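Technical annex B. To support the medicinal chemistry partners, we prepared a structural model of the target in complex with heme C, based solely on the information shown next.
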Amino acid sequence: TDPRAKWVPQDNDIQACDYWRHCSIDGNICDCSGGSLTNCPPGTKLATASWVASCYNPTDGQSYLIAYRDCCGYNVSGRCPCLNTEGELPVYRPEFANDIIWCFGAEDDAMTYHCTISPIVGKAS
Amino acid sequence: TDPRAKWVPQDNDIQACDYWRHCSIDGNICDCSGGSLTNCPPGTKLATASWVASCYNPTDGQSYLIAYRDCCGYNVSGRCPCLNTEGELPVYRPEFANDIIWCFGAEDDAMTYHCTISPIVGKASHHHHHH
Amino acid sequence: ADDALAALGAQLFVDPALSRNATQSCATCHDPARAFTDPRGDRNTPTLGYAALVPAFHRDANGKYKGGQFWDGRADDLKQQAGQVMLNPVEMAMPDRAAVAARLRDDPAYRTGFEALFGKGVLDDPERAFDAAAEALAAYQATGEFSPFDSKYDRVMRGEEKFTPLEEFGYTVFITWNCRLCHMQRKQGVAERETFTNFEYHNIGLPVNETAREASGLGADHVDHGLLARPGIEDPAQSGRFKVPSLRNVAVTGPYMHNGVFTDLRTAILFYNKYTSRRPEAKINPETGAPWGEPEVARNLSLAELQSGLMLDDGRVDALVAFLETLTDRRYEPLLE
Amino acid sequence: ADDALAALGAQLFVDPALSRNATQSCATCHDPARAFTDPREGKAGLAVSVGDDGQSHGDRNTPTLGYAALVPAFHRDANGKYKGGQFWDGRADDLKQQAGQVMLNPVEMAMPDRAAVAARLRDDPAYRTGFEALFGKGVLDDPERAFDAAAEALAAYQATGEFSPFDSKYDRVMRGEEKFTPLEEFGYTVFITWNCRLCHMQRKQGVAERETFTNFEYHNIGLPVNETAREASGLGADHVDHGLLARPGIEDPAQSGRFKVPSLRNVAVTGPYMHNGVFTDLRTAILFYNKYTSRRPEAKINPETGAPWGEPEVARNLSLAELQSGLMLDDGRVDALVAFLETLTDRRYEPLLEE
Amino acid sequence: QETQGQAAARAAAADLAAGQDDEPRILEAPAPDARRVYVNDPAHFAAVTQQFVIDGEAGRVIGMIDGGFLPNPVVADDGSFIAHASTVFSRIARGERTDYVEVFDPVTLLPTADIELPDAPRFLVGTYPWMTSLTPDGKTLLFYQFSPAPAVGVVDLEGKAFKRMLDVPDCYHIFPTAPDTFFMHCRDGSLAKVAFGTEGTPEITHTEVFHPEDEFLINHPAYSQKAGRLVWPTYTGKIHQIDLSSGDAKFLPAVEALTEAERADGWRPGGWQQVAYHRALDRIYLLVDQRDEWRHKTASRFVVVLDAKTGERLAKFEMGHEIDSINVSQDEKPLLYALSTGDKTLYIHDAESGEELRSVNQLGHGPQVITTADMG
Amino acid sequence: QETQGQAAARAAAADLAAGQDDEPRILEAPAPDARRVYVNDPAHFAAVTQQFVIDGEAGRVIGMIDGGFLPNPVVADDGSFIAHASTVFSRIARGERTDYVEVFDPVTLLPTADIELPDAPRFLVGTYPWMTSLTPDGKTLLFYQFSPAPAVGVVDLEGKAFKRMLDVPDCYHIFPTAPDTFFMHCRDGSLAKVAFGTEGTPEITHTEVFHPEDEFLINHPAYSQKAGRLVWPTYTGKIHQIDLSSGDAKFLPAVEALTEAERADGWRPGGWQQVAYHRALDRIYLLVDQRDEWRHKTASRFVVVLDAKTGERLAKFEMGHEIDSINVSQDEKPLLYALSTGDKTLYIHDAESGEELRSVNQLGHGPQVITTADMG
Ligand code: HEC
Ligand code: HEC
Ligand code: HEC
Ligand code: HEC
Ligand SMILES: [Ca+2]
Ligand SMILES: [Ca+2]
Ligand code: NA
Ligand code: NA
Ligand code: NA
Ligand code: NA
């Protein structure tokens, strides 16, 4: 609610902007347009590129690396928009930058942004 | 505000959806995207096609024919959206119907809807719709 | 002087003494019984009804010519037109102004009438006599009789009666389809004395009228360039353009267009479908069963207005005819079918 | 059983009696001083190894045995991807089957048959005692049982901690004992966000308990023939190494040219690289991947030769979806990845990094 | 009580705690069934638009389809495919226009056909379902053209090719009854039966005129192709029912959705898709409210339910929201779908009790059209 | 006091009573002047977007320009044209991609050039003004490419043709200083000066590293091409200033926009276009608020104004709305523009007093970028 307050993660609802894996999501949660937490919706193309954030999981007190991937080739879903920027750096440190449309590697050269998935790739360190 | 109440025209603000000449407008008022009450914005194309309504002017108590024209060739303006349907008939009476994109005759074959102007073209009314 | 000047013009108007060999008067080709057109040259004789409402010829601020008289606007106004038509070999054909003055001087009623309005000896001065006659003729055509605004349309707009459903549909078509871009006085607003023309000049791409052209003696190598023929107009964009006619009385003043090419009002309406319809039939003139014909002048066509994207189906053609018949002056309603 | 079996395997692993002319043990080609790989120069440099007969060269590069015990047994997953197994082409189901294959291969240890191996085991009193205590009296008189037991012992030895110690700087850093240098840390971040992670991480998502930087799948990354090794192996100019399709029982042409994704642990010390030893230098193996992403001319040139990388040996079935990532590694990110991969070196091999 | 987002959070936490791996991939939508519902967002005339595919039972978006300017959606009744006729331009809303039909697989949502329509022939209008229609066998899509005149285009979905334009009289909308026949509603008050060949002008036959010139038939009648039933309300909620099942039009007795007393008290239908029809129950649903006679496109807050055979009223539901469009699922125990353009939300009701069960929000900019398949 | 809508009603009514005629036509925008302001709406990554052209004095939309996916707007300082680099696809958001540059007449808004960029070379990113940039003479447009590697595309607007891609080091943003030279900011913390020709490896030189790896420079620095002044805030409101007007970078003293006490109490800049620079007053404006260190892209409610030469604070304005971006007009007594992405409203303030003067609402779906011309 207060947009400037420190972001407060939860592990109880993936469609909300404060779900702990969305700590550096920019765009829309794929689960709200027919994808899931870690899968793209039908008709879209899964990018191979990613950006990373270390996101704290209040369920287990561990910080995990979330390697976001975009689902691409469709106009933006318009459902569950979120923008968080925990640890997010400017564009010259692109591995942590989230205004970039990380659709590289998507099948069929898809490069429009539909939504983003939030899979874990490792423990932070 | 009651959307189902009889529409109450006014003659004091052309950007509002109850301005008297907008009695059968559907879309967006051109004056809010760089047009004026009876001119299209720069960059758009004025259609020659039109739809008509007999709109009562509360100021002078006369009913005027407003032959709406669309300004075409741009994505919808998004400013000052309005839909009124005074005397509006279904599509099989297209001279009175306002869901149709009346962009025919626009330069460069423009056919996308940007906004509508509300010029007067006569002082008359209709059998199906008179004050 | 107002009434008196017009009364002098009324006498001139029916007098064959204004024609080369005393064979015809203005009324010969502009019969008051037929809305001042010819009940019986390369261009069709237009009505005089409502001609007095046309502005003097001028170039407006956007570079469009408007107003004037004759199909090509070569006369600035009614007075200038009257002088031209008295001397034009294809109309009255008087050899010169002195000949006109001489005919006037021969008639004791004209001595009285012209001297009372223009001064003693006016008929001895050919320039003044001819100019006075033209002025009286113009004044006569500016009377209420020529522009009485008593058609059904007028009565309906005054709230005195109502259109029939078919006439109301035709009216609605007329004011929403391309006809109103040219056949209404104003762009928007309400005209005080509407005459169903914006007084502009447009090439609508009419074909030659073969038989009239044959009969004109102008030669088959003649091309009618419309407004470009006005002396002092040199702009090549005006070639082939003609003054938009008033549609008042149109139901009773056939045949139609500058060259009389269509006999029936319905044909004149259907011609506009050649620009919009994709049906094979839209290509055919129903009066001949053959293609309309290539434009006489294949440039400067008003394509922006004419290529409207919409075809008039037969029901809307019937509706426009019914609407156009409501523009007939009261005294001409007996002429309708 | 457990310790004792691995201990019997330890003895076998260094015993050249398991080669026909008794010139080589597993340790000859898999030298513990070199992360279990072959330091010997042959007719193709270090690309391929020389067998017991002193002449025969293999056509593939001898891989490390470190961490090979974490690989699953060969299987087809439900998506129709093959995974696991041993050898670059997965032709052994697991370590025990691999051990028997190499003992009998005439290009390597060249034992003529199982009876010959059992005969050598029978010549050694310590083997009589060690095998009999684990497998029963008379085991060494039954060539099938003797040979299977030996392979089992060798597999058990490779599954001990010595081979998979998890004591690299990477492991220390993940336990929070040390930190990466900024360059190593950048290398790590690149490795996990660029395409490397799609093949060289155990899991598709979540966290591995014992990561060995391979998903154990089979991919064709479009490598050329290493011509000096192919000449040394004598297989012929018309030979094609079909990778996984050469496994018996695999008949699917889509497997042609795919090889098992190698663990990158100890990669910095186990050059030359790839299944045929074709690149000497670690940086060159990393630069190879820019041939799928960079538009610069230099990206198609092998920096070791100054010539094009070469036509792939098998032009079909390339993993283009993964390889054609759209993004080229600049020299900074190549430096960073080298620094990071160097952190995967077991502690006991850190001194090899100097050279 | 547990929402889809909460259940998903729990499943993800359990997979993480269990060390379960899974491959990030493109999901398939669940197989099309009676309770799938499509919502089209014409986005108040925006140049690009969206369709939402929704599991009406769970109240979940299961996929989406992008479209161009005022596209017309169609859904095969048997579930085998969906399609739309759509329009794009080379520079967003300006430049060269391309109109085209896309057919989509209903589980992967991938286009399986993209069929260009020559000479930009679609009618661009606020979306009316029966301005583009499938034949009962699914092999043919018919779409309406207004300029230069009423016409109908024939698109062969089997051969994936535009075929030809059919000349018709001054008529509107397309109700297919056979592989080669459809009906349209004519300005003169008749329906036209249009029967078309490989070649030739079609054979066109008019019915008697069935309503007078001052009785106004809405732009959104309901039509059940499987029943041959055309349900056509007027501005006052009088309902024309035309039975097309024999192949020719039989006019059923007229029915009034509102009583005389209700009409004198100002009740009238109003909205966008004002009428739904359930084939198995032979039942009519109409969005109605108290309103001035020229507020016929405003939302309504009530639905009346009536027996199609007798006209008897069965129910009157207070919907609880400003509803613009309704439809129903065609299975037994149907759902009543109530879409609000203003709220951008589909409310999903029990059709028998009329109570709200669940809802799906954030359905684009101005969603207006609901389509279901009649799969039974 | 009387609104534009009211004044227009009063005028049309006067015209009607007087029988004044006028021709319906396409208007010209009024001549570009110092108080014209452009607002671009990236529309939260929608496939199509809009720019609004606003008379900042009247608070009136005077025109619009459509664009594709995340286009980069530019405005010539002298008022002679505007342009953008844009991207469209053959089926809304899928299919063949075309990137292109359009140049527009600033009064008719008609495109006077449309220049295809081969091989879809634009960097698709949330909109940063200095990712596409005009040279000072307005003859060349330079755009950034990220994939496969950082590179800069050179577009000849005079000849209306794409010229070439330049290879650059690992650097970002494009600040042109001459017809053939521009500066970038590199990952290593230096600026790179790139001097280029029609063919040939460009000459690239670096300044010293002017910031360490843990000081973060925002994606939206202000650059005055006419002053050669690059004003680059960090996440904490420390401001670097670099003078490029001699052709080589000279560094000016760094200043702090926030006091030590404010930073201890959690004040930090934040938003999108967080900084503006007025060239004639040599004044910097920065959007700030109390916020967590990682809420750097949230709106802010305050603007601090400081003397660029001394760092002295001149004002701190309470903007009274959630503001994401600011900019100023470059005339004498400037306007301070404050754009709210959430309200989709441009608020126009007196830059000296901070007073809100007027506002322009309904500016698309998520407007983010304000551009003005420096015509002085
Ligand atoms: C021999 C037949 C004939 C006679 C006699 C004749 N006219 Fe005409 N009238 C025409 C024709 C033909 C035109 C069109 C000629 C053209 O456009 O070049 C014309 C056009 C006019 C017009 C122009 C109207 C318009 O809308 O363009 C006026 C006014 C006019 N006549 C008045 C007169 C008067 C007054 C007289 C008597 C002095 C007269 N006419 C005698 C045949 C005649
Ligand atoms: C582009 C301007 C323009 C448009 C649009 C236009 N007209 Fe005309 N119309 C003219 C001109 C000019 C003439 C005279 C043409 C000529 O004779 O060369 C004319 C002649 C006529 C005539 C013959 C009048 C006579 O006295 O000979 C009729 C009838 C007519 N128009 C009806 C219509 C109707 C009905 C429509 C709408 C379908 C229409 N017009 C559209 C310009 C226009
Ligand atoms: C002459 C050199 C040589 C000797 C001796 C040798 N190896 Fe190997 N080793 C190889 C080569 C070459 C390969 C790769 C062959 C292939 O993939 O076809 C190999 C592969 C392996 C592999 C598969 C590892 C992987 O990642 O695929 C294992 C396990 C193995 N060796 C263990 C042994 C054991 C145990 C012995 C002693 C019984 C042994 N090796 C003796 C050269 C040798
Ligand atoms: C498509 C799956 C895939 C991707 C993506 C991939 N690799 Fe590999 N990698 C392999 C396979 C398979 C091999 C062995 C190839 C062969 O020898 O035939 C290999 C071999 C290597 C080797 C040689 C190891 C050895 O022991 O010889 C290095 C180093 C390596 N990869 C590093 C990387 C880096 C760094 C990246 C990211 C830039 C990367 N790889 C991307 C599959 C992949
Ligand atoms: Ca005539
Ligand atoms: Ca090796
Ligand atoms: Na003739
Ligand atoms: Na001339
Ligand atoms: Na070699
Ligand atoms: Na095989």
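Notes passed to the chemistry partners:
The beta strands of chain C are 58-59, 65-66, 201-202, 242-243, 284-285, 290-291.
The longest strand of chain C covers residues 58-59.
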